[PDB]
Design a protein around this ligand. Structure first.
Ligand SMILES: Cc1cc2c(cc1C)N(C[C@H](O)[C@H](O)[C@H](O)COP(=O)(O)OP(=O)(O)OC[C@H]1O[C@@H](n3cnc4c(N)ncnc43)[C@H](O)[C@@H]1O)c1[nH]c(=O)[nH]c(=O)c1N2
Ligand SMILES: O=c1ccn([C@@H]2O[C@H](COP(=O)(O)OP(=O)(O)O)[C@@H](O)[C@H]2O)c(=O)[nH]1
Length: 473
């Protein structure tokens, strides 16, 4: 029985998600193309010349779907399960994540400022909802929390002024505060712990996050996968329904599951009969994102007592260039050579926030010294660096309207643009979301489902847990 030809571009979690579902269904007429030598995309891991494994920034596995959990169990045996121990370095103190719920750990005067400003913003009411993320967190948390944490931290990570960001992506990312709880915490010095979908997470014992997608790759039919730099897609002809690669090859498709960046897709896709086609270049120009610099510092010995069981740490202040540090050796003993530990640092970059790359590593090290991560006597054996051009899809004001101008037109022509940058929706931008966007796209294409829940209803997916199992486990 011959079936429509499905081509997948990209072997990150989204693409592999589509491939896995097809495999589960026993579908035969499909092929996946990837221009990297290795599966995983932004979820790959790297082994440096000194024996240190690196992820591309802190990655931890936590799932909103039974399906993805099953896939993880199926792909990888040997998981470490950890309770999140995450902190914020601010005003000379270690404050438990989330900052806003734990202001009792601030020095007295900062704590008083945070509480008082929180009381004052409770006393202020408004006719209309906030127009942007900054107005939103300022009204919600008060000027104390905003000044000490929300504003400097959010610029430091997003590399975009938060006043240019929308407000509805925050549901599972920005914890709310309760004034009565906060006052009680202050009376009792009682930490407020365990908030959020990654309060518990898991991480592979060996090979970093990338081992997951390597194992997945090895489970799929090898003949249906292509990993080669010549297979970078550089033109989509939607009339002829072909994909032209950088090596000059041309292949046809009935359906295209594209996980390349949405801006890249719009600029390389040509055809007739697309409504609004002439606007595509302006749409692509308006898609806001930040780049991500990953710096891996390998250190002799063992981490200091205050970092013994730390996971990831946040740095709102200008004494460090990185917004986050991960004690990556605490996820697995095998991420480092014996007798060492490691810090994985993240520095954002954009048009609003340029980076001097020639001084970046040394600046990170100076930042570690100033932020209680390293001491002058620490011995550094590895200084790894990796720059991601497209790191975060900014939830910028106007994003949905831009997306709605092209996405339904692409889909009506059998082109499904999905994943972290394929759909450009940060709030469903993690590994489980991405993987499931691939699974769901296949379901839609094959008529098993009438809608794609994850990419279309971020609120629904993150408010519940999907219960359906993965059959190959
Ligand atoms: C700093 C940082 C930190 C985190 C995370 C990201 C980043 C940058 N993530 C998000 C996670 O990385 C993400 O959800 C997935 O990698 C996205 O999956 P995709 O397949 O959508 O994109 P992704 O970028 O992964 O994959 C796309 C693939 O398509 C390929 N491609 C692009 N253009 C092509 C072309 N023209 N031709 C052929 N191939 C092409 C690329 O090479 C790439 O391999 C995360 N998630 C999580 O669950 N927990 C976490 O803690 C984190 N933390
Ligand atoms: O103590 C904190 C730390 C972070 N955030 C917010 O949570 C968002 C998500 O950050 P996180 O490290 O959860 O996600 P990631 O950067 O990995 O996408 C950030 O942009 C912050 O605005 C917060 O409200 N309180």
């Amino acid at each position: 029985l011959l079936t429509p030809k499905i081509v997948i571009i990209g072997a990150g979690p989204t693409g592999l998600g589509a491939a896995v579902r097809l495999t589960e269904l026993g579908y035969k007429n499909w092929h996946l193309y990837e221009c990297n030598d290795t599966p995983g995309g932004l979820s790959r891991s790297f082994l440096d010349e000194n024996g240190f494994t690196w992820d591309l920034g802190g990655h931890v596995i936590f799932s909103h779907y039974q399906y993805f959990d099953d896939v993880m169990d199926w792909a990888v045996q040997g998981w470490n399960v950890l309770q999140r121990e995450s902190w914020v370095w601010v005003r000379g103190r270690w404050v438990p994540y989330p900052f806003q719920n734990n202001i009792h750990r601030l020095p007295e005067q900062d704590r008083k400022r945070c509480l008082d400003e929180l009381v004052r913003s409770h006393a202020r009411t408004y006719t209309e909802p906030p127009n942007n993320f900054e107005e939103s967190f300022t009204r919600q948390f008060g000027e104390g929390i905003a000044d000490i944490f929300m504003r400097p931290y959010n610029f430091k990570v997003w590399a975009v002024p938060p006043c240019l960001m929308s407000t509805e992506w925050v549901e599972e990312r920005v914890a709310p505060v309760d004034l009565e709880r906060i006052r009680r915490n202050i009376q009792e010095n009682r930490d407020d712990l365990g908030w959020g979908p990654n309060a518990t997470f898991r991480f592979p014992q060996r090979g970093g996050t990338g081992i997951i997608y390597q194992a997945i790759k090895e489970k799929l039919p090898s003949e249906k996968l292509t990993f080669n730099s010549g297979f970078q897609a550089i033109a989509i002809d939607a009339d002829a329904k072909t994909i032209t690669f950088s090596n000059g090859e041309v292949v046809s498709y009935d359906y295209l599951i594209s996980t390349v960046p949405f801006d890249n897709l719009l600029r390389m896709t040509k055809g007739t009969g697309f409504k609004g086609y002439d606007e595509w270049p302006a749409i692509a120009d308006k898609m806001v994102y930040s780049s991500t610099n990953v710096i891996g510092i390998g250190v002799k010995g063992t981490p200091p007592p205050h970092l013994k069981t730390a996971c990831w740490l946040y740095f709102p202040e200008d004494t460090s260039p990185f917004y986050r540090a991960t004690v990556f050796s605490n996820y697995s003993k095998y991420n480092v050579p014996e007798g060492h530990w490691s810090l994985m640092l993240e520095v954002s970059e954009s048009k609003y926030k340029p980076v001097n790359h020639s001084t970046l590593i040394e600046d990170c090290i100076v930042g570690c010294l100033a932020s209680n991560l390293l001491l002058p006597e620490d011995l550094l054996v590895s200084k790894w660096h990796y720059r991601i051009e497209k790191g975060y899809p900014t939830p910028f004001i106007g994003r949905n309207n831009l997306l709605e101008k092209a996405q339904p037109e692409l889909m009506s022509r059998c082109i499904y643009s999905r994943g972290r940058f394929g759909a450009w929706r940060y709030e469903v931008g993690n590994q489980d979301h991405s993987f499931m966007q691939g699974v769901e796209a296949i379901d839609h294409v094959l008529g098993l489902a009438t809608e794609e829940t994850t990419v279309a209803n971020p609120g629904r997916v993150n408010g519940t847990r999907a219960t359906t199992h993965f059959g190959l486990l």
